[PDB]
Ligand binder design. Sequence first.
Ligand SMILES: [Zn+2]
Ligand SMILES: [Zn+2]
Lengths: 707, 134, 114, 48, 176, 113
Amino acid sequence: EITPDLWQEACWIVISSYFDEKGLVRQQLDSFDEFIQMSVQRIVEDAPPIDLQPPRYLLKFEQIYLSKPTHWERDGAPSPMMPNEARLRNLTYSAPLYVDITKTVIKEGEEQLQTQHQKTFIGKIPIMLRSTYCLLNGLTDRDLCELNECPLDPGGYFIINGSEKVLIAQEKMATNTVYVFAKKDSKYAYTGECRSCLENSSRPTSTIWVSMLARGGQGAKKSAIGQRIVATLPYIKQEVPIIIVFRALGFVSDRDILEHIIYDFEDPEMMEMVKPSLDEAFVIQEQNVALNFIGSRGAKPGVTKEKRIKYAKEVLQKEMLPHVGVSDFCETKKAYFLGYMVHRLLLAALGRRELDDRDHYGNKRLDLAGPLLAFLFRGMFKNLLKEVRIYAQKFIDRGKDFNLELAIKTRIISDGLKYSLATGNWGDQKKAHQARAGVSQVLNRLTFASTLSHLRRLNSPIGRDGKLAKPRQLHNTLWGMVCPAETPEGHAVGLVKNLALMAYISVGSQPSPILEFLEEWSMENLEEISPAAIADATKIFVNGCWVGIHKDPEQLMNTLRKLRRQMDIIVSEVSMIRDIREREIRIYTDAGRICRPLLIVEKQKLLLKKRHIDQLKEREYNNYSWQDLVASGVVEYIDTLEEETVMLAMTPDDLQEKEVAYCSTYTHCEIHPSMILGVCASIIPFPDHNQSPRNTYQSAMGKQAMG
Amino acid sequence: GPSSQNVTEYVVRVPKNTTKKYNIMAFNAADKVNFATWNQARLERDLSNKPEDQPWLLRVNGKSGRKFKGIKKGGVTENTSYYIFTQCPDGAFEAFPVHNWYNFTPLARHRTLTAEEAEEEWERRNKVLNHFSI
Amino acid sequence: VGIRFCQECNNMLYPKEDKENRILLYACRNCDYQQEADNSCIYVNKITHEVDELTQIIADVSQDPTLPRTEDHPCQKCGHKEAVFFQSHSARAEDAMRLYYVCTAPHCGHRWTE
Amino acid sequence: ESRGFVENSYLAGLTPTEFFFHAMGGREGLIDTAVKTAETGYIQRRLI
Amino acid sequence: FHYKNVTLGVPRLKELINISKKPKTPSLTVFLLGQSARDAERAKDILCRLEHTTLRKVTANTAIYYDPNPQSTVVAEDQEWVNVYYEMPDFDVARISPWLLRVELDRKHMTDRKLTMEQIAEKINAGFGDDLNCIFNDDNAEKLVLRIRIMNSDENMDDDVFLRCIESNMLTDMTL
Amino acid sequence: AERGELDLTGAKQNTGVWLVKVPKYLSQQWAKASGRGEVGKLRIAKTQGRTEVSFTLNEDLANEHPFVLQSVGGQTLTVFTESSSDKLSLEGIVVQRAECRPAASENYMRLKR
Ligand SMILES: [Zn+2]
Ligand SMILES: [Zn+2]
């Protein structure tokens, strides 16, 4: 039942199962189907109504529809356009967009008159080829050839004015986590950061620092007391001490503040460090005067008092840490997290935990076509509602009536998307100076392996001439997820990169099923549990938010693993990290993390028995494939963060034999170590015999070979 | 004892109406408040907010007595309702809905540091340390 | 060396001096709760920083599948003949190539350097 | 062998872990040349 | 970098091209005139005599105690030497400060620079004023401690925060 | 007799109350309470080393919910009221907290396996 030394033909029969199902450009096709099934319905549904006024009116949007791509002839007779005519006649491949609007008039005229106009035209969205909304979805080769299309064409690009455009995945620093750096040039001796965004609903992302001033400050006013922890909130001009912003949330006492920041009072070394933080916030000792202090320096200095106490209320309520909670209630959570952010800044000053790494590839996320078009659709749906008002008010002051089919300017969404895609600058037409350029370039069709190597390409958005080497050098974390040899020379060395063969980017989900498991395993609520009894507990994070504590981690870990093996409740993409030393547990569900499959290993033997092979070489008339292999708990997707708590073996028959051995607690095993190379670098014979710079040249040279 | 071998069965009712709204009044155990010391109490919505949303102000013993401030919890029936179960003379149980959760905490009626004055004092103290050096 | 909290308003008790009985008194700034000091020392500053990390490493590290193991050095408190060793992995890395061990037997957690 | 010592020859071929470290060395050796040209050209123009 | 630290190549050239105030590693090479250029011991003594050395490099730990009387001796064993000073009691001019500062030294870092707390004792006085007063052990005792009190002429702004300021100021501005 | 005056009777009586967490679907069944408001019957079995409480739905309400007892330690809980006549009253102190759960919530067994 075991697989002894028949391995060289067994590893290439599971890899065949992978590519027969997934393909090579599932990267592009899956983020689009997401943006257009969920990410577009949520944007119009979660939009404020436009109550407006005597009588007053109502308007709210309910449901979105789409139809197959269509072309309107010269005399107004529609017909479905095939992707070929779009190339020949310099057309554009797009689909019309509808919506249901309901309108109720509220004049308390002894009757509430409501009416609705369903399937109202809005605009036209481009369509990525071979998606679930294209005319080529699920066709057979006898029909793909009948429309003059190539059965080998991968898909995953747009047709815009005849051209063929492709979207480049952009890198981005991870959000909703705490990073500790040390700027050795400025006044700060340490710094923390946390970019927050409340679940895909905010155009900006509010960032907050928690600094600490330098030690060698020339001056006896501070020579004795020491460094003071400071904070730089958004939408305010001046720095603020932390005890002040703590009191603005309540918690005026100094026994209650110093239990959110220090979790055990048998530590004199840390309490000494927080003592000179109270001395400067000692005279201002009540809530309302504190709100005035922060409220005095904003985007507008308050002339009166009540406006400042009003102004300081929401900025500390809707711009401070929006990912924890934005409601005006539940402000004990914004206190704990702000405490954990400061408790972690002190640990970096006593030298108990190391600083974070900027280029560690576990702190990065990738923006595919999904999270890129959704960002561009918000700024043009708000812009469409901002100009129904301007047309309603001008038209209702005369008191005549209202008509909405004439209010919707359809050229807003159509020409909005089509513009930025065709030209690249990720902004607006009158905003050809404030946008990020370099996205959406033209597909390369020189040879068939120059096409595939274009639909799989990353890009780090740092400058193209900066001489700093650390964003250009090769990090070891890039093992198995970015090709190590393939990169261009010149001024863009190491700035654009191609991803490896089996690397898979996640698409995203909601964490509610895991929350049901948390109640099922009785994870302790943060608010319910004693603050004093927290040190002997492992803080449980979920997606960046502190959501409780728990005192039985080892049992939980085995339980989480069995849940993953069945995969019944949790999708494979999710990653679950546990660091024994810092005593916490993290869980992620968002989109942008990069994965790759591995082989699960029990005590010292693989879980892939021979029974799985002799029935996997029969997929043609058995309906047993890659999906039935994940759902049986023999392979597993492993993120980059999770890849630091794992012990890998490179090859079964050679590293999992009992002897005087290197290790004995192997947790995973690789499929074949040849899947760490890109697309253009896996056509070289014997690449492990050449000097290294040679393999870089050919991978940038087989892209311009005639065929 | 009966806590070990004790057995019984009682009827439960959930009346669709009540003569008074039911709320929870929570105290920190760490304070170990002697309720017997509460000869009287006053209970009014807090005036800083100048109604149902208003935080409570509890004044024990009428004129001379203790004082607490109660702050409403974020949610109470967001996923699961809370019920008050009471024993009746007929042995049957009666269940009462929890309308709200208010958090009550003790108050320090001592020391009053002033804003502008405090900042001014800090600078002079800061200045004094710098003066007369070496 | 530790810290003192007030018994009325739960704040930080400062040290003060009274010119009557020559005894250290801990006072509060908010309230004026008082009491005397038992150890009669305030400040201490360790510059050698020679803290032995035998007081900072945890016993559950023996569950790590990425650490080397040994059959040579057995545990003393239980006699188990399998340990897992590592380095300081912290600061004070001037001459830091010692080798701390941890027994791997369940519910022993014994730690020792050499 | 665990920190970069490649003990094979180009003829006998390299093992994967050695092929990666070789790639790293080559990459840094490839970046330095890209910087040098611009630097020297500009400084010579100034001096002349 | 393949070659301690020296700057050469084109960055050193444009450090020579301009005369910018900031060389990335300024260094003065020094040569020795007498037999000190021959024997390693005199070379090492002038080495230590040229290098800068502050106080926090020669201290093990410091503690602020509270002796309202010099005979109280809160810590158990320092009573011997402080007492053999006390039978020779001088400088009880105004008061005796109840606040004490106790410093421990590391003879490893002491002897490597050929220092002993006598010269330290005079210069920590001669150089800061006379507001401080230093009594010390004998080096035959293994651990080298010297205790300091403020000059009691000030007691006839809190003295505790002042003593902490002085403690945090002398270990970095020592100039041994 | 004043609006801001709170009755302390319950507290001073040391009156005890029980606190039970109930799922919404059950609570929605309970809004349809049978008769005056009856929803069913509670069953309590205590042994020398095990105590079992459960509730069973009214046959009418149907057209076993075990209880999980939860600690009330660390935080003193009392119940206070507001009448429809806006009079204020303290009914009692909480002597028990609990959370009924549906029996055999699917697989759990599979997860354990
Ligand atoms: Zn106090
Ligand atoms: Zn042992």
